[PDB]
Ligand binder design. Structure first.
Ligand SMILES: [Cl-]
Ligand SMILES: [Cl-]
Ligand SMILES: [Mg+2]
Ligand SMILES: [Mg+2]
Ligand SMILES: [Mg+2]
Ligand SMILES: [Mg+2]
Ligand SMILES: [Mg+2]
Ligand SMILES: [Mg+2]
Ligand SMILES: [Mg+2]
Ligand SMILES: [Mg+2]
Ligand SMILES: [Mg+2]
Ligand code: NA
Ligand code: NA
Ligand code: NA
Ligand code: NA
Ligand code: NA
Ligand code: NA
Lengths: 95, 156, 154, 140, 186
RNA sequence: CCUGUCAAACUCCAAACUUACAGACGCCGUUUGACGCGGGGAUUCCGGUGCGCGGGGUA
RNA sequence: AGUGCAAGAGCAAAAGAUAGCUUGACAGUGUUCUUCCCAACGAGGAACGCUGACGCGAAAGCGUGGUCUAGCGAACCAAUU
RNA sequence: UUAGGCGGCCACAGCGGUGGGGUUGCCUCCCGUACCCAUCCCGAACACGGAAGAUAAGCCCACCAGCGUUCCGGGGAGUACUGGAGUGCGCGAGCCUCUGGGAAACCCGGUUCGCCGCCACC
């Protein structure tokens, strides 16, 4: 890479297809998850806040409590265990 | 310089003029020749088909075209035929003209990427194939071996 | 049910391929295993497709091989009819063979080593540089094709 | 069908596009209600570089205030045709514009469930000339 | 519409019915919404909750089914609003609902407006709702005093036939009084 | 309207493939203690080649 | 279009424009991720909490500066609360 | 749902167009400014009060595919590209065979002129 900011090489993953453009539906930003649930991590290009480091897009972690309205999801980066602060706006229930 | 230096399609496509400057103009005079006022309403239609993917510098394009059309004056300056070269030299080419230090070359020319089996030239004639000869001379000045293919023409 | 026979060595073969052969109980050239035709097992043999020889053997051939090259989970003991009878659910080799082919049981389930360590093909095989459709000995085979190999390595 | 299809005057805007005013006063009397400032956009050579800046006034008249005005405005105008909108509007003159439309226009001006008026229900230049011409004067 | 790349607004945005930015802030509370809506002739009050396939209305009240309790007056006014609010508020209580936040949709937050009246009614019914007292009408206007006095400038009945000539903010009390005890559907 | 061409820093499209998690089979571990945790000792931080994919360069 | 400035990205009853009011560019203490993929490493950065005090709004709520990714700096000594 | 309110998915729902619908009841347009409230100017809007009129808008209902979109058949195409294998071919660029996957454009014919949830309601 020529630089090392968090958004390096995120043109694709943090952009919306022309039609999914614009403010997202509120239903999924309010969704409630229970500790132990498996959730898929994916940033909503239209939703500014509650994001996590782009490197984790694609992860499937486990909800383990929350902080404020945001949730605390445990994932495993390679072989390292990590906790991710993320809002519902960027989570989906597995299965 | 020799075609040896630029005839292969091994490099990335380099054509974004918004990021490249100082690109030499093309030597190709025209792409439409003959009676361009008329539409392809001819009995016969022969084509020059490249047999290998290659890069053809605008140099060779102009030399090959001239050699063909300039000859198609076996039919006359305003003869009844229409000649078309369908490829344009989009691929910008450099040369590293310091040794291998900061070697990204400087724009020196342009070439056209043609894949094996494409037709680079297409002429339209009435049962008067002098054009077949105009191409024996044309593929004489381009790197690849070529195939002179006739399409609408069961008048053998 | 297909008969799997490693015909190419480990040196230079992809690790993820070698691991697969090992997951299928084959750890040496010429070793053979019997594998059920399931989606999961099918995916595996496909990945191993270039270093092996496989196919569905005929009742007889399986029987010949079982008799000649089958072994207990441990020990020298020859697996002959009597062994099969006094140790398995079946009454003789044929009984076993049939059950295997119809994929009703496995060499393990019957206290037998999952591997039939064959002998080098007598007369030599067709080559390990080309598949069957090319006159080689790699890849899927005919029931008649597999039988010839298996029998030559009996 | 009709009655709810027949034209009507909705606001008459009287504005003086000056270039920098004292003019409001006459607009106030000519109409009958306070004028509104007219700021401008973009910086330009006519020493009009100031973005927010008084450069004229306007007055939007509705109902009687609009008729009672046109009952003198129109007489001071001759023109017609070509000088008409594609939506049945027209401006003449100090400017005086007349916006014309049919009964269910609020559907497009309200907040809730607003909607654009269907082309069919729009007012045509012709259907406009008729209505007005049929009110103390002549077309072309 | 124009091309593959064109962006069509959410249906409820096209219909110009739902303000999705406000809806999101509304849903933040995690409480039921006290939907206050109006019509030229009526006034509706719903207590909506969130659901898997859309919202769930647990309790509602329409200014029309107000007569069902003795309403003999128009239904597009302040007293009407309050009452519909109180009625819905009560049915709400019966439903086990205890608190809600005021959703006034695309309406304006104007002081003494009918939506706030609706809110006042719901609150009195016993529903716990985040509000601000001095944005509400001064009781008398809620009663319908502003309309009675308007008919004082009579000369011609404010009500075409309807009931009464000088109108009745008293009819308002009798009704509120009624709703605060027993009766069916409450 | 017709007709001739393109894109490492274009995309209305779009693989193979790589990848998170889960289940199944396989293999493995429960006297050969896997997975994991804590600690002691390193060596090492001139690499090279083939193949696939590359970027530069006439090579 | 605009959003201060590269480039890529976000945004339309707004994140843009205008108006009005306001100083949350507030004090304190943390969790997490990043810096440093995996996989140890400081300063710095960000997201998300809690406590206190405020601003605005009818209210939900929004404000931990400017939409996001650049604008930064150890120990020792000095000055200051 | 003989016309309503809140929504979910967010064009299969968009764009354009045709036909139909309100005798007491619904939504509207509509009528009107004493009040709450309101326009840097206007009861236009916002807000409030109300029924003389109307079904012309909107809206609801039925339907049309010309454009945009979604999905499907057949053709393009097992083509392009591609994971694994090769003492197969080619001066080489590169190609070929076996194995496991497998497209895009475009053409022709269908589909699509929203689906679903909660509440209320001759
Ligand atoms: Cl993170
Ligand atoms: Cl409403
Ligand atoms: Mg990329
Ligand atoms: Mg043994
Ligand atoms: Mg021999
Ligand atoms: Mg051999
Ligand atoms: Mg990759
Ligand atoms: Mg911010
Ligand atoms: Mg020092
Ligand atoms: Mg100091
Ligand atoms: Mg009609
Ligand atoms: Na979106
Ligand atoms: Na130098
Ligand atoms: Na040649
Ligand atoms: Na840090
Ligand atoms: Na001003
Ligand atoms: Na209508």
């Amino acid at each position: 890479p020529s630089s090392n900011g968090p958004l390096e090489g995120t043109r694709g993953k943090l952009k919306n297809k022309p039609r999914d453009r614009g403010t997202s539906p509120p239903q999924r930003a309010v969704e409630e998850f229970d500790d132990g649930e498996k959730v898929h991590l994916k940033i909503d290009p239209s939703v500014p806040n509650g994001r996590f480091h782009p490197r984790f897009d694609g992860q499937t972690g486990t909800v383990e409590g929350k902080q404020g309205d945001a949730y605390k999801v445990d994932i495993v980066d390679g072989g390292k265990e990590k906790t991710i602060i993320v809002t519902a706006a960027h989570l989906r229930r597995q299965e | 310089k020799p075609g040896a230096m630029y005839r292969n399609s091994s490099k990335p496509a380099y054509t974004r003029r918004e990021y490249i400057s100082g690109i030499p103009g093309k030597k190709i005079a025209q792409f439409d020749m003959g009676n361009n006022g008329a539409g392809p309403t001819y009995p016969a239609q022969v084509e020059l088909v490249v047999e290998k993917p290659v890069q053809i510098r605008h140099n060779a394009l102009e030399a090959a075209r001239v050699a063909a059309n300039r000859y198609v004056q076996n039919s006359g300056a305003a003869a009844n035929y229409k000649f078309r070269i369908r490829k344009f030299p989009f691929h910008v080419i450099r040369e590293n003209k310091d040794g291998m230090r900061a070697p990204f070359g400087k724009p020196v020319g342009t070439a056209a990427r043609v894949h094996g089996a494409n037709h680079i030239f297409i002429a339209w004639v009435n049962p008067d194939p002098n054009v077949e000869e105009a191409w024996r001379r044309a593929k004489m000045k381009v790197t690849p071996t070529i195939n002179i293919d006739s399409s609408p023409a069961g008048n053998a | 049910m297909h008969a799997l026979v490693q015909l190419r060595g480990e040196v230079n073969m992809h690790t993820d391929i070698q691991d697969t052969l090992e997951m299928l109980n084959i750890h040496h050239v010429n070793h053979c295993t019997l594998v059920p035709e399931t989606d999961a097992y099918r995916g595996m043999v496909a990945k191993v497709n270039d270093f092996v020889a496989f196919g569905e053997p005929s009742q007889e051939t399986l029987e010949t091989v079982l008799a000649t090259r089958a072994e207990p989970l441990e020990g020298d003991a020859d697996v002959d009819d009597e062994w099969v009878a006094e140790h398995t659910d079946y009454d003789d080799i044929s009984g076993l063979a049939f059950a295997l082919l119809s994929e009703e049981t496995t060499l393990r389930e019957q206290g037998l080593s999952p591997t039939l360590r064959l002998h080098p093909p007598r007369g030599g095989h067709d080559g390990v540089k080309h598949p069957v459709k090319e006159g080689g000995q790699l890849g899927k085979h005919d029931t008649e094709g597999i039988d010839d190999l298996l029998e030559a390595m009996r | 069908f009709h009655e709810m299809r027949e034209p009507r005057i909705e606001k008459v805007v009287v504005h003086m596009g000056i270039g920098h005013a004292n003019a409001e006063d006459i607009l106030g009397e000519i109409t009958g209600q306070m004028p509104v400032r007219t700021k401008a956009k973009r910086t330009v050579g006519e020493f009009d570089i100031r973005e927010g800046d008084p450069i004229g006034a306007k007055v939007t008249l509705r109902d009687e205030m609009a008729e009672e005005f046109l009952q003198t405005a129109l007489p001071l105008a001759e023109l017609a045709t070509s000088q008409f909108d594609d939506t049945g509007n027209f401006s003449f003159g100090l400017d005086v514009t007349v916006n014309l439309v049919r009964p269910g226009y609020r559907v497009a001006k309200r907040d809730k469930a607003s909607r654009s008026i269907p082309t069919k229900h729009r007012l045509n230049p012709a259907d406009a000339v008729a209505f007005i011409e049929s009110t103390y004067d002549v077309e072309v | 519409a124009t091309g593959p790349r064109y962006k069509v607004p959410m249906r409820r945005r096209r219909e110009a019915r739902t303000d999705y930015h406000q809806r999101l802030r509304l849903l933040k509370s995690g409480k039921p919404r006290l939907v206050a809506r109006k019509s030229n002739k009526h006034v509706r009050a719903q207590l909506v909750t969130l659901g898997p396939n859309g919202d769930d209305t647990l309790a509602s009240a329409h200014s029309s089914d107000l007569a069902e309790y003795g309403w003999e007056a128009p239904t597009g006014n302040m007293p009407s609003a309050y009452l519909t609010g109180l009625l819905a508020g009560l049915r709400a209580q019966e439903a086990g609902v205890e608190e809600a936040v005021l959703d006034i949709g695309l309406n304006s937050p104007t002081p003494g407006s009918k939506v706030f009246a609706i809110q006042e009614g719901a609150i009195d019914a016993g529903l716990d709702i985040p509000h601000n007292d001095d944005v509400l009408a001064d009781w008398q206007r809620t009663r319908g005093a502003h309309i009675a006095e308007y008919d004082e400038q009579l000369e011609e009945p404010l009500y075409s036939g309807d009931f009464d000539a000088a109108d009745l903010p008293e009819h308002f009390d009798e009704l509120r009084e009624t709703l605060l005890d027993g009766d069916i559907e409450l």
